């Protein structure tokens, strides 16, 4: 599957073909169509995944044409200002401003309030400074009356996105903050009941990454 | 590490248990005092195989509690310093991998982990994966580590491991 | 003070000894410096900047060894410093950093973007500040 998408693999070196097989999997793009409904821990979707100009016949059967994982570029092979070594590349800032390689990032946060102990149990609510004894310095205005941040609210840095407290034998805050400091906007919020019957919810935080000097770009081979 | 030993434990028996066949009460008492505990010198006493013999019961003056020196055969888990042994990961945090070597729990510091490894908070579940992605350490993963040192705290043994040494990892 | 590992990019403009570092990473990293009359004002202004502004100090250490956090800034008098104090001012231009047992030192230069800049003459790295 990964080797088929390569044009002229015979013209290419064997390690390069093997190297692409790893890079092809690591390539980001539209993986399926029903990405919005599902909730995945890691899901990168490209803004403009277009079919390649040079495509193999076997590519049709893989359906990679329908869901490609890259954007074609007019590449000029030259040494410009000496800012590109053997392992490097120079981009066009204006092109990126037009959507050259921009892509979205989805990170799904999951949490459930379960009655593990008879005396102590988890609940979803706003961790008020008064009712809660132990808490971490963070902004809590994002949470709603139900303890879940509604879709459409921008979240940046250390911020609480789901409220959970434990009624220890006064309650102790055990909410979940953002994994990283990236600025993202919650896409959708889902509230469900787990197999045990306890309340369980999932929320997908969506962030926009703009290609920069630190991003790694790879051709279809090399 | 698991060993076969013969230990000595002074059993304190109340006079209330001075009824017929009191030796049975002493025998069953030994299955609760030294069983399931963790002596700091010989490590965790996971189980007791059999009883060697029961010594004469000496009555302590004033106290009134008869002391029974009993010899028993049991198996202990004593983590020797600088010993490499397999471990099971129970949780992963930015500080470092948290492993579980049988009854005890061993903590791996971030510095001890090879520099190539990098913690990933986005990946579900967390797992110390290097950039090359060749080796990844998920939860409940059988990994081999070397215990640099062990400390005894609150009647329990806490061990510190490292993976800097060669051939320490998933294999 | 180990930093967060970040990718490496080339920069021929920088000298081979010099190394480029982003503002965010340098903000977290701190370099304790003993205040002296010749540079008493330099530490006085940097501490006034605060942690919100990049050229600030994360903590200030008195002679007795007490560390006062500059994030809160409770009293202006506490902000004022005396001779002989230690101030954990954020890394700035001209500082010496060491990274990859033989390690090569480098002179840090602050650059806008995030990725590290090295005048090679890719792989992620973490730079240690003495």
């Amino acid at each position: 599957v990964c080797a088929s998408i390569i044009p002229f693999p015979d013209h290419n070196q064997s390690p390069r073909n093997t190297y692409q097989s790893a890079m092809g999997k690591q390539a980001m793009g539209v993986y399926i169509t029903n990405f919005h409904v599902r909730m995945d821990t890691l899901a990168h979707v490209l803004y403009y995944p277009q079919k390649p100009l040079v495509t193999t016949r076997s590519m049709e059967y893989l359906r990679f044409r329908e869901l490609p994982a890259g954007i074609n570029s007019i590449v000029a092979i030259a040494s410009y200002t000496g800012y590109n070594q053997e392992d490097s590349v120079i981009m066009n800032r204006s092109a990126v401003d037009r959507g050259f390689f921009r892509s979205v990032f989805y990170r799904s946060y999951k949490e459930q309030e379960s009655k593990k102990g008879f005396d102590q149990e988890e609940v979803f609510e706003k961790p008020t400074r008064e009712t809660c004894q132990g808490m971490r310095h963070a902004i809590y205005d994002k949470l709603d009356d139900d303890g879940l941040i509604a879709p459409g609210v921008r979240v940046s840095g250390d911020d609480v996105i789901i409220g959970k407290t434990v009624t220890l034998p006064t309650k102790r805050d055990c909410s979940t903050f953002l994994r990283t400091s990236e600025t993202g906007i919650v896409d959708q919020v889902m509230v469900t009941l787990n197999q045990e019957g306890y309340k369980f919810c999932k929320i997908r935080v969506r962030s926009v990454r703009i290609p920069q000097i630190g991003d790694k770009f790879a051709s279809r081979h090399g | 590490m698991f060993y076969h030993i013969s230990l000595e434990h002074e059993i304190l028996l109340h006079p209330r248990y001075f009824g017929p066949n009191l030796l049975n009460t002493v025998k069953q008492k030994l299955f609760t005092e030294v069983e399931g505990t963790c002596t700091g010198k010989y490590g965790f006493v996971i189980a007791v195989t059999t009883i060697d013999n029961i010594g004469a019961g000496v009555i302590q003056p004033g106290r009134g509690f008869v002391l029974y020196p009993v010899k028993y055969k049991a198996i202990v888990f004593r983590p020797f310093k600088g010993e490499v042994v397999d471990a099971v990961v129970t949780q992963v945090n930015k500080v470092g991998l948290f492993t579980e070597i049988g009854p005890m729990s061993c903590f791996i510091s971030r510095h001890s982990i090879p520099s190539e490894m990098e913690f990933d908070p986005n990946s579900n579940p967390p797992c110390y994966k290097t950039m090359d992605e060749d080796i990844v350490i998920q939860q409940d993963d059988e990994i081999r580590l070397k215990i640099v040192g062990t400390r005894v705290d609150k009647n329990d043994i806490f061990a510190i491991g490292s993976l800097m040494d060669d051939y320490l990892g998933l294999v | 003070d180990f930093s967060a590992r970040t990718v490496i990019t080339p920069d021929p403009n920088l000298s081979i000894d010099q190394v480029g570092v982003p503002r965010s990473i340098a903000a977290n990293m701190t370099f304790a410096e003993i205040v002296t009359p010749f540079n008493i004002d330099r530490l006085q202004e940097l501490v006034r900047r605060g942690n919100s502004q990049y050229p600030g100090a994360k903590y200030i250490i008195r002679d007795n060894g007490d560390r006062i956090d500059l994030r809160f800034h409770p009293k202006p008098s506490d902000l004022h410093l005396q001779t002989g104090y230690k101030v954990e001012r954020h890394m700035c231009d001209g500082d010496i950093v060491i990274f990859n047992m033989s390690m090569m030192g480098h002179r840090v230069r602050i650059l806008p973007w995030s990725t590290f800049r090295l005048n090679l003459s890719g792989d992620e790295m973490n730079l240690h500040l003495p």
Binding site: E182, G214 | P121 | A4, S114, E124
Partner: peptide, 4 residues
């Protein structure tokens, strides 16, 4: 990497 940097945000981590």
């Amino acid at each position: 990497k940097i945000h981590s």
